[PDB]
Write an enzyme that holds these catalytic residues in place. Structure first.
Site, PDB file in Angstrom:
ATOM      1  N   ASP A 127       0.818  -1.208   0.000  1.00 29.84           N
ATOM      2  CA  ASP A 127       0.000   0.000   0.000  1.00 29.84           C
ATOM      3  C   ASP A 127       0.853   1.259   0.000  1.00 29.84           C
ATOM      4  O   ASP A 127       0.588   2.192   0.763  1.00 29.84           O
ATOM      5  CB  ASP A 127      -0.936   0.019   1.214  1.00 29.84           C
ATOM      6  CG  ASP A 127      -1.982   1.116   1.125  1.00 29.84           C
ATOM      7  OD1 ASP A 127      -2.263   1.580   0.001  1.00 29.84           O
ATOM      8  OD2 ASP A 127      -2.523   1.513   2.181  1.00 29.84           O
ATOM      9  N   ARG A 131       0.062   9.036   1.712  1.00 24.77           N
ATOM     10  CA  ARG A 131      -0.595   9.075   3.014  1.00 24.77           C
ATOM     11  C   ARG A 131       0.039   8.142   4.039  1.00 24.77           C
ATOM     12  O   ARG A 131      -0.255   8.267   5.233  1.00 24.77           O
ATOM     13  CB  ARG A 131      -2.070   8.688   2.908  1.00 24.77           C
ATOM     14  CG  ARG A 131      -2.267   7.305   2.337  1.00 24.77           C
ATOM     15  CD  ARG A 131      -3.712   6.864   2.386  1.00 24.77           C
ATOM     16  NE  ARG A 131      -3.830   5.497   1.898  1.00 24.77           N
ATOM     17  CZ  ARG A 131      -3.742   5.153   0.620  1.00 24.77           C
ATOM     18  NH1 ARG A 131      -3.614   6.062  -0.334  1.00 24.77           N
ATOM     19  NH2 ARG A 131      -3.786   3.865   0.291  1.00 24.77           N
ATOM     20  N   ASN A 132       0.901   7.226   3.608  1.00 20.82           N
ATOM     21  CA  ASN A 132       1.576   6.290   4.494  1.00 20.82           C
ATOM     22  C   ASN A 132       3.032   6.661   4.712  1.00 20.82           C
ATOM     23  O   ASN A 132       3.749   5.936   5.410  1.00 20.82           O
ATOM     24  CB  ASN A 132       1.442   4.856   3.971  1.00 20.82           C
ATOM     25  CG  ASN A 132      -0.006   4.370   3.976  1.00 20.82           C
ATOM     26  OD1 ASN A 132      -0.792   4.729   4.856  1.00 20.82           O
ATOM     27  ND2 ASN A 132      -0.361   3.547   2.998  1.00 20.82           N
ATOM     28  N   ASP A 145       3.856   2.039   7.708  1.00 20.53           N
ATOM     29  CA  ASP A 145       2.679   1.199   7.497  1.00 20.53           C
ATOM     30  C   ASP A 145       2.951   0.175   6.398  1.00 20.53           C
ATOM     31  O   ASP A 145       2.073  -0.148   5.593  1.00 20.53           O
ATOM     32  CB  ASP A 145       1.445   2.044   7.176  1.00 20.53           C
ATOM     33  CG  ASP A 145       0.825   2.661   8.420  1.00 20.53           C
ATOM     34  OD1 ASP A 145       0.897   2.035   9.501  1.00 20.53           O
ATOM     35  OD2 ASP A 145       0.277   3.778   8.319  1.00 20.53           O
TER      36      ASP A 145
HETATM   37  N1  LIG Z   1       5.021   7.634  13.503  1.00 21.98           N
HETATM   38  C1  LIG Z   1       4.240   8.858  13.481  1.00 21.98           C
HETATM   39  N2  LIG Z   1       4.821  10.047  13.638  1.00 21.98           N
HETATM   40  C2  LIG Z   1       4.112  11.185  13.620  1.00 21.98           C
HETATM   41  N3  LIG Z   1       2.799  11.187  13.445  1.00 21.98           N
HETATM   42  C3  LIG Z   1       2.136  10.021  13.279  1.00 21.98           C
HETATM   43  N4  LIG Z   1       0.833   9.726  13.086  1.00 21.98           N
HETATM   44  N5  LIG Z   1       0.687   8.411  12.978  1.00 21.98           N
HETATM   45  C4  LIG Z   1       1.846   7.805  13.083  1.00 21.98           C
HETATM   46  C5  LIG Z   1       2.090   6.303  13.028  1.00 21.98           C
HETATM   47  C6  LIG Z   1       2.373   5.655  14.212  1.00 21.98           C
HETATM   48  C7  LIG Z   1       2.595   4.292  14.214  1.00 21.98           C
HETATM   49  C8  LIG Z   1       2.540   3.579  13.034  1.00 21.98           C
HETATM   50  O1  LIG Z   1       2.757   2.200  13.089  1.00 21.98           O
HETATM   51  C9  LIG Z   1       3.696   1.745  12.161  1.00 21.98           C
HETATM   52  C10 LIG Z   1       4.994   2.226  12.177  1.00 21.98           C
HETATM   53  C11 LIG Z   1       5.915   1.753  11.259  1.00 21.98           C
HETATM   54  C12 LIG Z   1       5.535   0.797  10.331  1.00 21.98           C
HETATM   55  C13 LIG Z   1       4.237   0.313  10.324  1.00 21.98           C
HETATM   56  C14 LIG Z   1       3.315   0.788  11.237  1.00 21.98           C
HETATM   57  C15 LIG Z   1       2.248   4.224  11.842  1.00 21.98           C
HETATM   58  C16 LIG Z   1       2.025   5.594  11.839  1.00 21.98           C
HETATM   59  C17 LIG Z   1       2.845   8.822  13.292  1.00 21.98           C
END
Ligand SMILES: Nc1ncnc2[nH]nc(-c3ccc(Oc4ccccc4)cc3)c12
Length: 265
Positions: A127, A131-132, A145
């Site tokens: 994905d 946005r990721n 993500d």
């Molecule tokens: N890391 C952020 N830093 C600032 N703002 C934010 N908003 N959301 C997040 C976020 C937090 C955890 C997350 O899990 C993950 C992390 C890495 C890989 C997969 C999944 C994915 C995104 C975030």
């Protein structure tokens, strides 16, 4: 690795994402981190947890690090490196008049490097989209993500025809066969480059998912962005070859990017 929430502090709300609430905080005092509370009922917990130990072992400067997890309670906590500037898509839109094409190509080097590391570990994203991707305080872009879509229970998010499936980032073999490969992540990277140089515009904004799928299937490709040179466009267009084997790997892509950067001097 497991983390005792005793060693965490909740300091600010960052908002609710696709996979649950997220907050800014501190881990072990000295680590700025973002703790996401996994929406209940959204994930196959056992599978996701076991894979989380793997995503813990993936490390690269340009990949949003996973520092650990809290799994002996629900909602599961995920402790990740803190990206002060939030989502890359909104970062692109908010600083629309404050990005030079050199910074855009940099953002592409960042993403391509992270995806080349993921390619080299035989690990798929499934994905890749703006946005990721997240941005830290120094304007650096990082992927996040990755592999998360493998564990979503909602069939709309997973099926080729699901109402929430990211058709506009999907390769033809993903829409028609659900064939995920590093080549589909490359197609997605092409679309991402288009997002970057478009400064965050929705690809095929005025197309229904179906209309997009069919146009893609018949040869339609995103237009060259205004801020994209004929060389940058060649790279993101090469990501969109109909034949998967015809698309260049992330390593070859990173090299091309570096060539453009050198020619941008
Ligand atoms: N890391 C952020 N830093 C600032 N703002 C934010 N908003 N959301 C997040 C976020 C937090 C955890 C997350 O899990 C993950 C992390 C890495 C890989 C997969 C999944 C994915 C995104 C975030």
């Amino acid at each position: 690795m497991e983390i005792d929430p005793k060693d965490l502090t909740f300091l600010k709300e960052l908002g609710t994402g696709q996979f649950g609430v997220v907050k800014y905080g501190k881990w072990r005092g000295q680590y700025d981190v973002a703790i996401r509370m996994i929406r209940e009922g959204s994930m196959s917990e056992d599978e996701f947890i076991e894979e989380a130990k793997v995503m813990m072992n993936l490390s690269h400067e340009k990949l949003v690090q996973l520092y650990g997890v809290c799994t002996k309670q629900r909602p599961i906590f995920i402790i990740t490196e803190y990206m002060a500037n939030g989502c890359l898509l909104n970062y692109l839109r908010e600083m629309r008049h404050r990005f030079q094409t050199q910074q855009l190509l940099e953002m592409c080097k960042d993403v391509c490097e992270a995806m080349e590391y993921l390619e080299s570990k035989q690990f798929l994203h499934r994905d890749l989209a703006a946005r990721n991707c997240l941005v830290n305080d120094q304007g650096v872009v990082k992927v996040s993500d990755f592999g998360m879509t493998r564990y979503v229970l909602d069939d709309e998010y997973t099926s080729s025809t699901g109402s929430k499936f990211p058709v506009k980032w999907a390769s033809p073999e993903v829409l028609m066969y659900s064939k995920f490969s590093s080549k589909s992540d490359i197609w997605a990277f092409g679309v991402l480059m288009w997002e970057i140089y478009s400064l965050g515009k929705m690809p095929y904004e005025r197309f229904t998912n179906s209309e997009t799928a069919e146009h893609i299937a018949q040869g339609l490709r995103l237009p060259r962005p205004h801020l994209a040179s004929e060389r940058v466009y060649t790279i993101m267009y090469s990501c969109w070859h109909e034949k998967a084997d015809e698309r260049p790997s992330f390593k070859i892509l990173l090299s091309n990017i570096l060539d453009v950067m050198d020619e941008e001097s």
